[PDB]
């Protein structure tokens, strides 16, 4: 390799290091500059001829990464040589080919060729190393600007759904797909059909993970409202069970699938966490001994492990006075229009909090 | 030359420990002061010091063991201290060398000779360095036993896990030291320049690959003391592990000495959760909760603990019930007042400046967070921002000039004003 | 004319001077006294302006020993090659418990004030005074002093310059009310990391709520007074 | 993955970086300096700099590398924790002059950190473009300039950046230091002020037609929170003991100025 800072040349000075490569290249470079100074030709050789087994040809890639863009198209050609990374399957130093061309540089974005291309390509050709490292970013820009282009939105839905499987972890999978399922039924892929086989995928990783609670997540924005529950998926046999405070409902209510893989032991974890709340934050702060553990119909130390168990999650969380008092505030599980109504309560509430005190605290000072 | 000097000092150590004991100050005080001469002195046909190990690392290596066991053996003490400052004397005028063997030797028994006297804590920093320093004489000692590994892990844990607070109680009377520079000293000579930390020190000693080498009598213990939750269940849980260890005597006997101490500290751990867990809790339930030998030693100790203000409770009672309290009077009394050993999860708990401050930056997040208001106004401010800037690079324009022939002349005029000053 | 006395103004500390005494904030120099560095500035209108600070560092170990003043001279040379000159007209130890301007402290600044009358002594007070008024302490010696120079001795000129009753509790200058013109690029910063990279600005700003609820700091305050100053209380 | 990725500056650097720049350095359109601080191996942790007798010419550039000696020896034992670190300029971005403070760089021999501290009114253009060359082979020419994307945080110290948030609001306004604390007091309420006219919005957003998903269950949960921080629950058990609680504070403030009446009067007889 010789450095960029030699004369320019652009296409002769990234064909020079072909002659340094390959034989294949090197004729090619010959080949290819005898007959022009040339675009596609010579533009498409490092990107699709062997950079051979070993891939510290990252330095003549990087130099093929700026001049390839401008001179003819970079949509094109920026998706060539990436079909070569995920080829070799070495990926760390392919990263530095993805690295230094990621977004925002070296030209013009474009809107999301560079921004598809370049990560559908971390995504398979690194691990989960290079893969996370662009996730903010990603998703930064998909805020500033989403895809007016459909199907660039769908593919952008396709690389967090290649991100969920890529991932093996169960909650950044339940965060990449309910950031995938919250962009579905928002916009693109809706478009019914595309988005009802999503909602199946999305009642498996609801009902399987029981820190995606119930359906507390569901009811705070758009996925339910999308996707029907009295409907065949069945969306909404959660919402039936959720307050239902019992094993007996999800059991008859069953999709033979579910209930084998599936969410057998959940639906005790259910009757706890939902009994537990609508016992407590209706009342709304304080049960007795007793009364939680006949709604719970269990034991007395147990329902005692039991608040360890919900002290964990942080559904109740105080000091617990032995006899009475059993679970208290810090209310995280659905309470619907209860939640709304104290929240219509709140701004009269806060009225004087806001101005009352201040008129003390302003006029002191 | 001529060692011979070696063998006396041995019969001399010998004799001592022996016969009277006296000797001891006698023979250290005169072995003191030749070392003094020499050191000190330099002025004559003797020794040539310069790079002549040999007879160095042979004397302070026969001392040192004379010193150390012989201290540790006729329940001396002084001597031994003596004796350690000498050798960091040594180490200051004889650390032009890179260093030879022997090291490892001398660090271990000085730890070894510790533990007790001094706290676990400091002892169980002493083992960590010799630990480290078993790491070093690897790659240059070569040692290979997956045995070795497992005491050393052992001896690390306990030295550690044993102490999460002192009790200082001579300071908290009389003020008040005159009693840490000394403490200071003490964590030179190991080595330290501060002194050591707590289970800390096992996340410092664990950095390196210590969950894996950890042989697993042990292993699976303290993935419940530091790793596993949860208060109502951790004296069920850690007692099987210690039933295991407890059997001492290929597990290294230093251990299971350490291990009482670490089962008290276990319990002062869960002691300390449960005032934020419970707001009271009856004495007949209480000691359902913790497998312990006797529950009259143990509220004696939770008693002990509470007047040592490292919790709040009233288990002695009329009843016989206990109440941690929601606030009562809030105090670092309940929090243990400079040092946790435990997870964080306090409850929510009133002091001053709370619902002050709390008001706001509280609801200052939620109109941050979410608002529809906040960030026209932002960007509206954002538009007074470019402004200023746009203000600015005319002004820069002009201070460019201006404090340009301010900043030339300011080194001339104010150099002569301050030197009609002087 | 809020001008000092007889051959000085005030003083304005710009922002960038005060960043860099937070740098070298309340360590190196925690527990013992440390000058941490001399305020350079120049004669402004109404005011001196510390533009800016280099720090002065001493072997700080556990104590502190004073060093080769090789450091000074390099780092004031240093000062003067890229920027102004050695302009020092002031000094800032934080340094050590909330704002206390001790004998040893006097008797530097005496030594000071007689060289350059063109100074102030700051005391840079952050979080400790539990923050907490008067976070910077400003204070220069009384020109009657430097009149009845050197020295006050046990019986004479104790007495006889008791009796001539120079201030003692004598007059501190504010330090700031007005646009320092170093306000610009900081000001440009302000929009940029606020609302849409507000992660730092936040960060910032709810240290106050732990500044609140945690471990006994009023408390703290009210003990460390109810030891440091029934101990002066006695002594007199 | 391959390492540096992103800088974390502090608002000291900028400080540092604005200082010779304005002093002036014979700073027409650009001052340079050498940035100092250390790296952790994906990230840079960029602490303090002060910047070397620079002066770039449209064909000479003069780095005295020896003068970054002597300040990185000076500021070795200011904090032990700075290194030599790369080089720091104003704008504008990458010209010929990247390729030459490149070389006398080079001399050192790590990787360079390369800042540009654009300076235009503009809030389209980004305040600090943080840069670290790719090819970078170095057999070549005199060093391949193709410029990593990294991106700029703060990042140092807390209490520096509540002394920055200090500057922030002088730079809106003065915000002296007298009253500090009552100006905390003061915005306090108004925070709740403006969450009147927010929490308003939310309400008002069902009230017309629909709307309020916006604090159904997002503003919902984060006022629960908020009412289960400040104040506590509410028996009248809490009222008399936060009642006890300022009847012990006040007669705390009380003995306070107690003390301050007797400081008085030892020192009043003395000096009769």
């Given at each position: 390799f010789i450095?960029?800072?030699?004369?320019?040349?652009?296409?002769?000075?990234?064909?020079?290091?072909?002659?340094?490569?390959?034989?294949?290249?090197?004729?090619?470079?010959?080949?290819?500059?005898?007959?022009?100074l040339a675009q596609i030709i010579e533009a498409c050789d490092v990107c699709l001829k062997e950079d051979d087994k070993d891939v510290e040809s990252v330095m003549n890639s990087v130099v093929s990464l700026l001049l390839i863009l401008e001179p003819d198209k970079?949509?094109?050609?920026?998706?060539?040589?990436?079909?070569?990374?995920?080829?070799?399957?070495?990926?760390?130093?392919?990263?530095?080919?993805?690295?230094?061309?990621?977004?925002?540089?070296?030209?013009?974005?474009?809107?999301?060729?560079?921004?598809?291309?370049?990560?559908?390509?971390?995504?398979?050709?690194?691990?989960?190393?290079?893969?996370?490292?662009?996730?903010?970013?990603?998703?930064?820009?998909?805020?500033?600007?989403?895809?007016?282009?459909?199907?660039?939105?769908?593919?952008?839905?396709?690389?967090?759904?290649?991100?969920?499987?890529?991932?093996?972890?169960?909650?950044?999978?339940?965060?990449?797909?309910?950031?995938?399922?919250?962009?579905?039924?928002?916009?693109?892929?809706?478009?019914?059909?595309?988005?009802?086989?999503?909602a199946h995928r999305c009642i498996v990783r609801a009902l399987k993970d029981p820190n995606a609670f119930l359906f507390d997540h569901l009811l705070t924005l758009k996925p339910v409202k999308f996707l029907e529950g009295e409907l065949i998926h069945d969306l909404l046999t959660i919402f039936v069970s959720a307050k239902l405070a019992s094993y007996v409902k999800?059991?008859?209510?069953?999709?033979?699938?579910?209930?084998?893989?599936?969410?057998?032991?959940?639906?005790?974890?259910?009757?706890?966490?939902?009994?537990?709340?609508?016992?407590?934050?209706?009342?709304?702060?304080?049960?007795?001994?007793?009364?939680?553990?006949?709604e719970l119909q269990i034991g007395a130390d147990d329902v005692e492990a039991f608040v360890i168990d919900a002290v964990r999650t942080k559904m109740v969380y105080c000091k617990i006075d032995q006899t009475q008092r059993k679970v208290v505030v810090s209310h995280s599980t659905h309470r619907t229009f209860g939640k709304q109504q104290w929240q219509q309560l709140y701004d009269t509430l806060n009225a004087w909090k806001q101005n009352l005190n201040k008129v003390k605290n302003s006029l002191l000072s | 030359?001529?060692?011979?000097?070696?063998?006396?000092?041995?019969?001399?150590?010998?004799?001592?420990?022996?016969?009277?004991?006296?000797?001891?100050?006698?023979?250290?005080?005169?072995?003191?002061?030749?070392?003094?001469?020499?050191?000190?002195?330099?002025?004559?046909?003797?020794?040539?010091?310069?790079?002549?190990?040999?007879?160095?690392?042979?004397?302070?290596?026969?001392?040192?063991?004379?010193?150390?066991?012989?201290?540790?053996?006729?329940?001396?003490?002084?001597?031994?201290?003596?004796?350690?400052?000498?050798?960091?004397?040594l180490f200051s005028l004889s650390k032009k060398p890179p260093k030879p063997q022997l090291m490892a030797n001398y660090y271990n028994k000085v730890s070894t000779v510790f533990w007790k006297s001094g706290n676990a804590l400091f002892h169980a920093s002493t083992l960590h360095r010799l630990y480290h320093l078993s790491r070093e004489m690897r790659k240059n000692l070569t040692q290979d036993e997956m045995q070795r590994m497992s005491t050393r892990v052992l001896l690390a844990t306990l030295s550690i896990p044993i102490t999460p607070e002192r009790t200082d109680i001579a300071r908290l009377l009389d003020m008040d030291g005159i009693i840490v520079e000394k403490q200071r000293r003490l964590a030179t000579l190991l080595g330290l320049q501060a002194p050591p930390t707590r289970i800390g020190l096992i996340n410092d000693m664990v950095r390196f690959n210590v969950l894996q080498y950890v042989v697993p009598e042990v292993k699976d213990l303290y993935n419940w003391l530091e790793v596993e939750f949860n208060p109502l269940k951790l004296c069920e849980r850690v007692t099987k592990v210690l039933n295991w260890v407890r059997e001492?005597?290929?597990?290294?006997?230093?251990?299971?000495?350490?291990?009482?101490?670490?089962?008290?500290?276990?319990?002062?751990?869960?002691?300390?959760?449960?005032?934020?867990?419970?707001?009271?809790?009856?004495?007949?339930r209480l000691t359902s909760l913790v497998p312990f030998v006797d529950a009259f030693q143990l509220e004696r100790a939770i008693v002990d603990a509470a007047r040592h203000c490292d919790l709040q409770v009233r288990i002695d009672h009329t009843s016989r019930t206990l109440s941690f309290g929601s606030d009562l009077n809030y105090a670092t009394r309940e929090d243990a007042p400079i040092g946790p050993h435990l997870q964080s999860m306090p409850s929510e708990q009133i002091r001053n400046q709370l619902t002050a401050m709390s008001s706001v930056l509280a609801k200052a997040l939620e109109v941050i967070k979410?608002?529809?208001?906040?960030?026209?106004?932002?960007?509206?401010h954002q538009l007074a921002v470019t402004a200023y800037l746009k203000n600015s690079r005319k002004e820069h324009q002009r201070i460019l000039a201006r404090r340009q022939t301010i900043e030339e002349r300011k080194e001339r005029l104010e150099s002569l004003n301050i030197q009609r000053e002087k | 004319g809020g001008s000092g006395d007889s051959a000085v103004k005030q003083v304005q500390i710009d922002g960038l001077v005060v960043l860099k005494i937070i740098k070298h904030y309340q360590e190196e120099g925690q527990g013992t006294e440390v000058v941490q560095g001399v305020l350079l500035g120049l004669v402004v209108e109404d005011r001196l302006e510390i533009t800016?600070?280099?720090?002065?560092?001493?072997?700080?170990?556990?104590?502190?020993?004073?060093?080769?003043?090789?450091?000074?001279?390099?780092?004031?040379?240093?000062?003067?090659?890229?920027?102004?000159?050695?302009?020092?007209?002031?000094?800032?130890?934080?340094?050590?418990?909330?704002?206390?301007?001790?004998?040893?402290?006097?008797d530097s600044q005496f030594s000071y004030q007689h060289a350059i009358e063109e100074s102030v002594v700051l005391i840079y007070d952050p979080i400790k005074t539990a923050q907490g008024s008067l976070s910077l302490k400003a204070y220069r010696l009384t020109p009657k002093l430097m009149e009845v120079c050197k020295e006050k001795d046990f019986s004479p000129e104790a007495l006889k310059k008791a009796n001539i009753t120079f201030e003692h509790m004598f007059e501190e200058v504010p330090i700031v009310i007005k646009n320092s013109h170093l306000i610009n690029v900081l000001m440009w910063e302000l929009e940029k990391k606020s609302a849409v990279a507000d992660k730092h600005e936040l960060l910032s700003l709810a240290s106050s709520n732990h500044l609140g609820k945690n471990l006994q700091l009023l408390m703290d305050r009210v003990d460390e007074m109810s030891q440091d100053i029934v101990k002066y209380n006695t002594y007199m | 993955f391959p390492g540096g990725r992103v800088v974390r500056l502090h608002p000291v650097i900028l400080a540092s970086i604005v200082d010779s720049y304005e002093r002036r350095n014979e700073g027409a359109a650009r001052v340079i300096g050498t940035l100092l601080g250390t790296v952790d191996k994906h990230s840079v942790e960029v602490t303090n700099c002060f910047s070397v007798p620079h002066n770039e010419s449209e064909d000479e550039v003069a780095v005295d590398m020896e003068f970054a000696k002597n300040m990185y020896e000076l500021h070795k034992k200011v904090s032990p924790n700075e290194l030599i670190l790369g080089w720091y300029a104003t704008g504008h971005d990458i010209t010929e002059h990247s390729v030459l403070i490149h070389e006398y760089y080079s001399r050192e021999a790590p990787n360079p950190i390369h800042l540009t501290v654009d300076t235009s009114l503009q809030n389209g253009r980004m305040s600090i473009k943080a840069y670290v060359s790719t090819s970078m082979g170095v057999p070549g020419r005199t060093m391949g300039v193709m410029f990593t994307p990294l991106t700029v945080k703060y990042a140092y110290y807390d209490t520096e950046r509540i002394g920055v948030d200090l500057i922030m609001k002088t730079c809106f306004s003065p915000n002296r230091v007298i009253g500090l604390s009552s100006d905390l007091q003061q915005v306090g309420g108004a925070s709740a002020r403006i969450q009147d006219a927010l929490s308003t919005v939310l309400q008002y957003a069902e009230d017309v037609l629909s709307g309020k998903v916006s604090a159904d269950n997002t503003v919902g949960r984060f006022l629960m929170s908020l009412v289960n921080q400040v104040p506590k629950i509410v028996p009248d058990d809490f009222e008399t003991m936060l009642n006890s609680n300022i009847n012990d504070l006040l007669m705390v403030t009380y003995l306070a100025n107690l003390t301050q009446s007797q400081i008085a009067l030892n020192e009043k007889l003395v000096n009769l």
């Open positions: 450095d960029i800072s030699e004369e320019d040349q652009a296409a002769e000075l990234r064909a020079y290091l072909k002659s340094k490569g390959a034989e294949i290249s090197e004729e090619n470079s010959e080949g290819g500059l005898h007959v022009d970079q949509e094109a050609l920026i998706e060539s040589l990436c079909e070569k990374l995920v080829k070799f399957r070495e990926g760390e130093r392919p990263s530095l080919r993805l690295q230094l061309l990621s977004n925002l540089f070296h030209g013009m974005d474009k809107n999301t060729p560079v921004r598809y291309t370049v990560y559908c390509s971390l995504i398979k050709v690194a691990a989960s190393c290079g893969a996370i490292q662009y996730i903010p970013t990603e998703l930064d820009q998909v805020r500033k600007w989403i895809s007016d282009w459909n199907l660039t939105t769908e593919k952008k839905h396709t690389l967090l759904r290649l991100l969920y499987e890529a991932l093996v972890d169960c909650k950044k999978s339940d965060a990449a797909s309910k950031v995938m399922v919250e962009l579905l039924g928002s916009y693109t892929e809706d478009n019914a059909s595309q988005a009802r086989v999503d999800f059991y008859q209510n069953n999709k033979d699938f579910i209930d084998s893989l599936g969410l057998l032991h959940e639906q005790n974890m259910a009757k706890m966490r939902l009994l537990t709340f609508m016992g407590m934050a209706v009342e709304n702060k304080e049960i007795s001994f007793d009364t939680m553990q006949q | 030359v001529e060692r011979l000097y070696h063998d006396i000092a041995q019969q001399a150590f010998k004799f001592c420990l022996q016969y009277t004991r006296k000797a001891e100050f006698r023979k250290l005080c005169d072995n003191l002061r030749m070392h003094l001469s020499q050191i000190q002195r330099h002025h004559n046909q003797s020794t040539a010091i310069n790079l002549n190990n040999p007879e160095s690392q042979s004397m302070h290596l026969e001392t040192r063991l004379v010193q150390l066991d012989s201290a540790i053996s006729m329940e001396l003490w002084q001597e031994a201290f003596k004796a350690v400052e000498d050798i960091h004397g001492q005597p290929e597990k290294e006997p230093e251990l299971q000495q350490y291990v009482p101490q670490l089962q008290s500290n276990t319990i002062l751990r869960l002691l300390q959760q449960v005032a934020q867990i419970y707001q009271s809790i009856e004495f007949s979410p608002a529809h208001i906040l960030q026209e106004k932002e960007e509206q | 800016n600070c280099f720090p002065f560092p001493q072997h700080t170990e556990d104590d502190a020993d004073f060093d080769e003043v090789q450091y000074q001279m390099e780092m004031m040379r240093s000062l003067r090659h890229v920027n102004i000159d050695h302009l020092h007209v002031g000094w800032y130890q934080s340094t050590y418990y909330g704002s206390f301007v001790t004998r040893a402290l006097l | -």
